[PDB]
Design a binder for this molecule. Structure first.
Ligand code: HEM
Ligand SMILES: OC[C@H]1O[C@@H](O)[C@H](O)[C@@H](O)[C@@H]1O
Ligand SMILES: [K+]
Length: 377
């Protein structure tokens, strides 16, 4: 199947499942990569940095030192920047973070109220909430919302350069733009917030710069598109918000919403040393694309995998990855989604579909182009 085909983009999960039912580890000749849709296989590969990696220099590919980043480094170089970032994260008092995240979500939901017409929740909520959320965490002044979204979208689309090579160049321009933003914050930002703390811990400057850019961009786009998908489920299934509304009830719901609507559809690795993966033998130099969203629909692990079931065992889904590169912001994201759920219950606003959910032609990171709804108090 063509991952950018409109009908695939409309709902890829049947295509994931049919791929998996024929072979959990599938060689895609025209992409020249293994496609891994089984839960056990994605989980195996994600955690094994000895045989599968993110630093293509381990297969003798020249990567300039100027381009190195936390997400493209493996042990031993990965540990230095990784724990630097985690240490800066852990300096942020969570009471403050929750206060900020809750206020941002409430503010944008109130702007939506009193609107008697159709509203786009992507541009009106997911994106602006994501941007204010991540820059509040970083302790830096928010950039212009529309302008930032354009640069960042170019980068998301460049992730599909394997499918459409022309999508690659716009990303290089957008990366350079975010690098300018990161450079400016490193020079000017307050000692409060994440940026200030990471600057103190400092690892080479390029790794730090590109790693801060990764925090900015991953955090913006992961949260933005998580909210889009979650809201899309909620507008069609408002009963999800009618639940008990306890802490533990929202914990289970958040886990299911992240399992089902996590935006990361593909997480790539390179084979550094031969290893059996599923029914196949993967060879050194082979690229593996882990379809972790499909893995998160593996019926062997998640019965009725396309259904929200609030009594499932926690700790299973792979939407934050697993192992050395597992999402640094996983705690922040589950926190942020709780506050959104909480704000929606406190808003009592009624959001009903005002048209179809429209998805953007991005295959690696799933995102809505538009989520038209009507608001009713
Ligand atoms: C405040 C929010 C977030 C921040 C700051 C953030 C940042 C990051 C960073 C810096 C990494 C790289 C870790 C490394 O390579 O060592 C990462 C990895 C990852 N993130 Fe997050 N992210 C956020 C939210 C999310 C959300 C909501 C999702 C999905 C629901 C997500 C999915 C992932 C995944 C799957 C990985 C692993 C990629 C891999 O295996 O290399 N992130 N994130
Ligand atoms: O798969 C697209 C992206 O998922 C992300 O959460 C991480 O930022 C990257 O490691 C990865 O390239
Ligand atoms: K060198």
């Amino acid at each position: 199947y063509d991952p950018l085909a409109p009908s695939v983009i409309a709902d890829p999960y049947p295509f994931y499942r049919k791929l998996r039912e024929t072979n959990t580890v599938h060689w895609h000749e025209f992409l020249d990569s293994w496609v891994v849709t089984g839960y056990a296989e994605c989980r195996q590969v994600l955690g094994d940095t000895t045989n599968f990696g993110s630093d293509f220099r381990r297969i003798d590919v020249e990567i300039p030192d100027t381009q190195l980043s936390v997400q493209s480094l493996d042990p031993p170089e990965h540990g230095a920047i990784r724990h630097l970032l985690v240490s800066a994260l852990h300096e942020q008092p969570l009471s403050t973070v929750r206060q900020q995240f809750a206020a941002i979500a409430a503010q944008h939901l109130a702007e939506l109220s009193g609107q008697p017409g159709t509203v786009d929740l992507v541009s009106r909520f997911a994106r602006p909430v994501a941007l204010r959320t991540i820059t509040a965490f970083l302790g830096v002044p928010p950039p212009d919302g529309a302008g930032f979204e354009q640069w960042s979208n170019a980068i998301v689309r460049s992730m599909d350069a394997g499918i459409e090579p022309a999508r690659a160049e716009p990303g290089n321009q957008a990366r350079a733009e975010l690098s300018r933003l990161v450079t400016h914050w490193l020079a000017e930002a307050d000692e409060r917030g994440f940026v200030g703390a990471a600057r103190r811990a400092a690892v080479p400057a390029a790794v730090l710069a590109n790693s801060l850019r990764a925090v900015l961009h991953a955090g913006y786009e992961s949260v933005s598109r998580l909210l889009g998908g979650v809201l899309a489920r909620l507008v069609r299934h408002p009963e999800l918000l009618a639940g008990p509304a306890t802490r533990d009830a929202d914990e289970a719901l958040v886990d299911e919403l992240i399992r089902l609507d996590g935006p990361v559809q593909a997480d790539a690795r390179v084979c550094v040393r031969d290893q059996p993966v599923g029914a196949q033998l993967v060879r050194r130099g082979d690229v593996l694309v882990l379809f972790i969203a499909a893995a998160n629909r593996d019926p062997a692990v998640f019965p009725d995998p396309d259904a929200v079931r609030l009594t499932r065992r926690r700790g299973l889904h792979l939407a934050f990855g697993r192992g050395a590169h597992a999402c640094l912001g996983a705690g922040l994201a589950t926190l942020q989604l709780r506050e959104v759920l909480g704000a929606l219950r406190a808003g009592g606003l009624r959001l009903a579909p005002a048209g179809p959910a429209a998805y953007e032609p991005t295959a690696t990171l799933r995102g809505l182009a538009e989520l038209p709804v009507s608001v009713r108090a």
